[PDB]
Design a protein around this ligand. Sequence first.
Ligand SMILES: CN[C@@H]1C[C@H]2O[C@@](C)([C@@H]1OC)n1c3ccccc3c3c4c(c5c6c(n2c5c31)CCCC6)C(=O)NC4
Lengths: 329, 257
Amino acid sequence: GAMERVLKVFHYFENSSEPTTWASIIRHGDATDVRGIIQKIVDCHKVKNVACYGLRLSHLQSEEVHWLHLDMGVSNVREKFELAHPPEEWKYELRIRYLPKGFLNQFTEDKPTLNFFYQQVKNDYMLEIADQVDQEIALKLGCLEIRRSYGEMRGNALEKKSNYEVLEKDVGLRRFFPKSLLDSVKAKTLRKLIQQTFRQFANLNREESILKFFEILSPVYRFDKECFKCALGSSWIISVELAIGPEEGISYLTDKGANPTHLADFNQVQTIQYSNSEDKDRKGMLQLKIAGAPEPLTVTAPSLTIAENMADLIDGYCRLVNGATQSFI
Amino acid sequence: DYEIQRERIELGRCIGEGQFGDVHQGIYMSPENPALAVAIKTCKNCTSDSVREKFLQEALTMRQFDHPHIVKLIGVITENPVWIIMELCTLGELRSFLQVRKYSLDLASLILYAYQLSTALAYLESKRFVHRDIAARNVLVSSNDCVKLGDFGLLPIKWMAPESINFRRFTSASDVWMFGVCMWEILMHGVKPFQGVKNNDVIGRIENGERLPMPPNCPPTLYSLMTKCWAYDPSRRPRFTELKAQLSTILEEEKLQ
Ligand SMILES: CN[C@@H]1C[C@H]2O[C@@](C)([C@@H]1OC)n1c3ccccc3c3c4c(c5c6c(n2c5c31)CCCC6)C(=O)NC4
């Protein structure tokens, strides 16, 4: 390596400041690769479920996402993407990606991870679906974040004017609610609405807020799996939507929402390979060898990147469901 | 430049515990004139860029302040182990000062400290700086007739404004809240607010309109002044600048026999 420079690693560990600037500054003195990065950050917050974390590197003016292999070096990852577009244009982001066979009730015994998964999922929701979600769902969730964030106030503190005033004037309600929720109705009505729908969640501790936050979020937001338009077969090729998740392993969708067809679980995987598909075109092959089955499970993805992502994903789950630190690619 | 050569500092006895590292008393051979008596703040986790970055900040903010009742920053030794050299308040912590001298200190002196404290705090608001922990235990005594505010680094539930407990907001107005408790501690001769009261109850009591009693022998105008600092609604509390002038006539009143 040449420079040598900073690398700001944006994370979802709560730091009582501003969730946009939650990041670890990881200087030259650590580590040498990616499995390095993660281990430094997770250990600061004494994480149990280390298997579940991954590093995402995305350009902040495009939607394409790059999951970084565990062993791929620090400098040579930087020196394949970063060095083409002025370095201050990439977002390094630590994320939970590989979920256990019952994540909520497991993250429970691991405070640091539960808050992390909460924050991450909360941020997706606030960034993607909060504005065209059913508005009282938006109400229930924001109140729940208030209830969580300020664990020390009695459940009827917002009843007092000066307390609501603190949330409205100083911290800003946009921190809990989507722009549309606040602009839709009069401010005095907004005040009454918040206090009232708060009444049902007034009594809950931090965990219970989080759990009910998920409970209320799950029937309207996908966060328990990832889905991929792709193809299957090594000669005859069929378009399918792939669901990859803890509760149905690797499955396909048709479409939707018929009981998804389970293909393979994560313990049944042996190897993972990916190519530039040649043939030709910049598409990506993916090939899974599965215990018992003779011919491998081929997957044709629209781009190389998508396969490199699908790989990381099954790669991540194979590691977790086994007990391995060595990848399966 | 506030940089000091370690040769010119003799480290002495230890005098406090912060949460970066111990506070020491020492000697500083300036060529200014003779051997100055300093307090030396030290750091335990010097072997890390992050801790140092912040530890040094304390010194770097303190630079911006120059005031008769805020401990001066004399300088910094920026090499491991990092030290912040500042002036020694020889007569020590206010609580211990008052306790020892319960029956030898007049009301006027007590009101004097409160006032000096408020010049400090008014000074700081004029600089937009929020203390976050005004309390007797953070006040050092330089002389009989002179106290100074110390710190300045980033839970004291019994001292905190409701909004600091509820929503973790710290402002000038929360400062004024803590200053009130502080005057109370002074006027009670370093006796802690809510002794025998669990933190979690204290929060409820205050929530219910309850306040600290009027300390015996405290003069009513002043206790009236403290109660204003404990308005629940932050906007109803006086600014430090008005406390200052209030405390001034209150003192001149007591002094004027
Ligand atoms: C009971 N409170 C402690 C008393 C002690 O040590 C602390 C940790 C605390 O004083 C604010 N301390 C500081 C903490 C952070 C920045 C500056 C100081 C500080 C300072 C002093 C000091 C003293 C004592 N303590 C001092 C100081 C006790 C004995 C007399 C002097 C001091 O004299 N100048 C800065």
